Design an enzyme around this catalytic site. Structure first.
Site, PDB file in Angstrom:
ATOM      1  N   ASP A  44       0.840  -1.195   0.000  1.00  0.00           N
ATOM      2  CA  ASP A  44       0.000   0.000   0.000  1.00  0.00           C
ATOM      3  C   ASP A  44       0.874   1.243   0.000  1.00  0.00           C
ATOM      4  OD1 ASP A  44      -1.429   2.225   1.872  1.00  0.00           O
ATOM      5  OD2 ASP A  44      -2.968   1.123   0.743  1.00  0.00           O
ATOM      6  N   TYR A  49       3.288  10.012   0.775  1.00  0.00           N
ATOM      7  CA  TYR A  49       4.266   9.375   1.656  1.00  0.00           C
ATOM      8  C   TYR A  49       5.707   9.730   1.266  1.00  0.00           C
ATOM      9  CZ  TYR A  49       0.187   6.485   3.024  1.00  0.00           C
ATOM     10  OH  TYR A  49      -1.058   6.038   3.418  1.00  0.00           O
ATOM     11  N   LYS A  79      -2.508   6.296  -4.007  1.00  0.00           N
ATOM     12  CA  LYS A  79      -3.563   7.236  -3.644  1.00  0.00           C
ATOM     13  C   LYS A  79      -3.314   8.615  -4.237  1.00  0.00           C
ATOM     14  CE  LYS A  79      -3.751   4.875   0.834  1.00  0.00           C
ATOM     15  NZ  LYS A  79      -2.307   4.532   1.035  1.00  0.00           N
ATOM     16  N   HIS A 112      -7.341   9.894  -1.631  1.00  0.00           N
ATOM     17  CA  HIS A 112      -6.784   9.773  -0.272  1.00  0.00           C
ATOM     18  C   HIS A 112      -7.702  10.367   0.804  1.00  0.00           C
ATOM     19  CE1 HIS A 112      -2.566   9.185   1.675  1.00  0.00           C
ATOM     20  NE2 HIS A 112      -3.503   8.946   2.571  1.00  0.00           N
TER      21      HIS A 112
END
Length: 324
Positions: A44, A49, A79, A112
């Protein structure tokens, strides 16, 4: 024993995946290597990130043509970030993710959050005081732009992250491509029974982040109990000869809730996927149900005069003002 669930597209999505949330670029490659070795076939990811390039390098070592793991045997999720909700920005955002991950397609691509931030190249367009500037783009308009990506073959399935039941139905009311997955915070303190039931009635499967109760955030509320230390969790751990983390994950597995525990620790990464060789009784499931208390760890916060308060609760499209 069953270790995946079927999405409405026919895809098998593994019940355990590796979370890369909070994995620093310098650490994430080792985490991916350990996870693949431990049998993970679900990773994931998210652009926000800040580590997709490194993840792409790690996957390229062992995933693809002539490699240990064929591409079709891996499930990769990413996302769309909050600053990329304008329809014109959606495909470029996905293309950037595919370039970084060095992939032809994603297995799943999620919005997201339902709410948009100011458009631009800064994922957190912040004012001097720390608040984030918003954008008015509605998630229905973003959804329509996402649907195009499926026709182009760039994404196998679309889904939603941090949407509430009303918002999910709103997307469904206009969808030509149906969301396949909802990803939300979920663990025994926030069991999401109402929202999971809602998703199951709509044909969506559910993925849990923070399934181990975010003990890395415990210090924010030092007098609150730690989920991994709950007496019932410790008692189940002893009874079954499994770790507390494995107890919390097995509970979700049995509920058919996909889990994506984040880690870079080799021992914990390995432990976290060893949840298919023991079973809870109906009585044990009900004991774990008793922990439900509407405690939500993952809410964007900001410090105002020495106190943490919610940052985004005034956004028109904030998801956490409704009961579920």
């Amino acid at each position: 024993t069953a270790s995946s669930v079927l999405l409405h597209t026919g895809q098998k999505m593994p019940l355990i995946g590796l979370g890369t949330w909070k994995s620093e670029p310098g650490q994430v490659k080792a985490a991916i290597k350990h996870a693949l070795s431990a049998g993970y076939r679900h990773i994931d990811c998210a652009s926000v990130y800040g580590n997709e390039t490194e993840i792409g390098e790690a996957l390229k070592e062992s995933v693809g043509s002539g490699k240990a793991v064929p591409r079709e045997e891996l499930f990769v999720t990413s996302k769309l970030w909050n600053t990329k909700h304008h329809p014109e920005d959606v495909e470029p955002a996905l293309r950037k993710t595919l370039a970084d991950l060095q992939l032809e397609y994603l297995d799943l691509y999620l919005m997201h959050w339902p709410y948009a931030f100011e458009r631009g190249d800064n994922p957190f367009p912040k004012n001097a005081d720390g608040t984030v500037r918003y954008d008015s783009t509605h998630y229905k308009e973003t959804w329509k732009a996402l649907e195009v990506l499926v026709a182009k073959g760039l994404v196998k399935a679309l889904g939603l992250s941090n949407f509430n039941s009303r918002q999910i139905d709103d997307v469904l009311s206009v969808a030509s491509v149906r969301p396949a997955v909802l990803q939300v915070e979920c663990h025994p303190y926030l069991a999401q029974n109402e929202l999971i039931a809602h998703c199951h009635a709509r044909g969506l499967e559910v993925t849990a982040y923070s399934p181990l109760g975010s003990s890395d955030r415990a210090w924010r509320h030092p007098d609150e109990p730690v989920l991994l230390e709950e007496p019932v969790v410790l008692a189940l751990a002893e009874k079954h000869g499994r770790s507390p983390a494995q107890i919390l994950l097995r509970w979700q597995v049995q509920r058919k809730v996909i889990c994506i525990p984040k880690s870079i620790n080799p021992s914990r990464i390995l432990q976290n996927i060893q949840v298919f060789d023991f079973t809870f009784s109906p009585e044990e499931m009900k004991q774990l149900d008793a922990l439900n208390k509407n405690w939500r760890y993952i809410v964007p916060m900001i410090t105002v005069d020495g106190k943490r308060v919610p940052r985004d609760a005034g956004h028109p499209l904030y998801p956490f003002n409704d009961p579920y």
